RNA sequence: GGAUACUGCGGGCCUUGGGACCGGGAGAGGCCGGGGGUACCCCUGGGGUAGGGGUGAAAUCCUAUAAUCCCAGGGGGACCGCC
């Protein structure tokens, strides 16, 4: 029988995470970072990272018997920023090389309809 | 002593300036009461294992007394996005 997941992405400007669960979002499967696969911080982000983080959980998913998968991307959002980051696209092709069938995707970036204050100090960074 | 255009004073008239009233409409004008929208934070439960955040690069910090992440619920305070 043919069983789908759903893969939760979480990308930054500063990291990458999939996250592979059943239809629920209760039961989960696997879950990898950029952090588990380099050792510079400052690449963590790379698409490459993401790559293979997403490999890494689509092989595990596909070991438990996951066959489909819908997609959820995602960026922090709230009052930090509501771009993704360039992970995101590469985990996606990731994991339809992998061997998982690809259902719907959607963009799930929470954003204020009014909300609270950004970090900034009314003057923003000034490096 | 004389004159009466202008100004002042006294008395009548006018509607052009201003004010009052009727009509159908406009508008984030103000005050009062009620109902909501997402987002954020804390707590409690279930899943899961080792890193998360953050930078020009890093470290202080949170994390094995189970974090970041996903799900179901409860509470609270400010604000009212696109149009």
Redesign the pocket.
């Known amino acids: 029988k043919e069983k789908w997941g759903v893969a939760?992405i979480?990308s930054?400007?500063?990291?990458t995470?999939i996250?592979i669960?059943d239809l629920?979002?209760?039961?989960?499967i696997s879950?990898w970072?950029?952090?588990?696969v380099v050792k510079?911080?400052?690449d963590?982000p790379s698409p490459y990272a993401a790559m293979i983080a997403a490999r890494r959980a689509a092989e595990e998913a596909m070991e438990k018997g996951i066959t489909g998968v819908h997609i959820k991307v995602?960026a922090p959002?709230?009052?930090?920023s509501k771009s993704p980051g360039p992970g995101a696209q590469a985990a996606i092709r990731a994991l339809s090389r992998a061997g998982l069938r690809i259902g719907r995707v959607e963009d799930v970036t929470?954003?204020?309809?009014?909300?609270?204050r950004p970090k900034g100090g009314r003057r923003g960074r000034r490096?």
């Open positions: 939760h979480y930054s400007y500063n990291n995470i996250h669960t629920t979002g209760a039961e989960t879950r970072s950029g952090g588990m510079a911080d400052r963590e995602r959002g709230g009052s930090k929470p954003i204020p309809h009014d909300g609270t490096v």
